[PDB]
Structures are given as structure tokens and as C-alpha cells.
Amino acid sequence: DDCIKPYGFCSLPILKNGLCCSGACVGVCADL
Numbered sequence: 001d002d003c004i005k006p007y008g009f010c011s012l013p014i015l016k017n018g019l020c021c022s023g024a025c026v027g028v029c030a031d032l
Contacts, residue, residue: 004029 003021004010010018010025020029 006031 004018004025006020006022006029008020008029009027010020010029012025012027014025014027017025019025022029022031024030024032026032
């Protein structure tokens with residue numbers, strides 16, 4: 001387990017998904 005990197009790829013569907021360190025995931029990790 002780890003976090004996913006900001007502006008690295010996570011996955012979808014995003015409700016719960018692999019968690020980005022900057023929080024937001026929408027295919028790519030971002031911030032919102």
C-alpha cells in the first residue's frame with residue numbers, strides 16, 4: 001500500500017479508488 005503520486009495515474013471508477021497523496025483522483029491524480 002502507498003499513495004498514488006500527484007499527476008500520476010490512478011484508475012477509475014473514482015468514489016473510493018487508489019488514493020492519491022493530493023487526494024483527488026480522476027484517472028490521473030490531481031488536487032481539487
